[PDB]
Amino acid sequence: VGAXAXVXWXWXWXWX
Amino acid sequence: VGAXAXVXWXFXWXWX
Ligand code: NA
Numbered sequence A: 001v002g003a004x005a006x007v008x009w010x011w012x013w014x015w016x
Numbered sequence B: 001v002g003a004x005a006x007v008x009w010x011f012x013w014x015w016x
Helices: none
Strands: A002-015 B002-015
Antiparallel strands (some): A002 B002
């Protein structure tokens, strides 16, 4: 849990 | 739904 890649908040593919 | 900022897959903060 923290910063980098995976899932959650920020840039890439999903919803916003 | 798609690419850009928000929740889902990618970079930033959350789970690896
Ligand atoms: Na995200």
